[PDB]
Amino acid sequence: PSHSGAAIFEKVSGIIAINEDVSPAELTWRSTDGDKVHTVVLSTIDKLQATPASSEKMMLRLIGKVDESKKRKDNEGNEVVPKPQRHMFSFNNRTVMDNIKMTLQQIISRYKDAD
């Protein structure tokens, strides 16, 4: 319910489980069938996102820190500054996603204290 909730990740329906038993708190999206799985490291996550009341949807998105260690470049080896990649999980209930979101955010704020 809070540390776990069924979400859709890239149009596939599955489940989400934020677990802190683990190396820096991890979310684990495990498909409802148990086929595919996608784990998120909250510490590699810079920001977490979740639909506001103003939004017509209910969805989360965990933003991973962009790779500043080696700046990227374009086809000719110029230079580009990548926008941080993100992990979006779609929910069907704003309470659920509020529960999931609040769970992660607490972890994120936890890791920003130690960032």
Binding site: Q49, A50, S55, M59, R61, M102
Partner: peptide, 24 residues
């Protein structure tokens, strides 16, 4: 989005593309 026009929404488009809010 895109750029090269008046009152363009470049960069704003991708940022508002989420439709979410962060709780911090």
């Amino acid at each position: 989005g895109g750029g090269g026009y008046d009152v363009e929404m470049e960069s704003e488009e991708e940022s508002d593309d989420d439709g979410f809010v962060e709780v911090d």
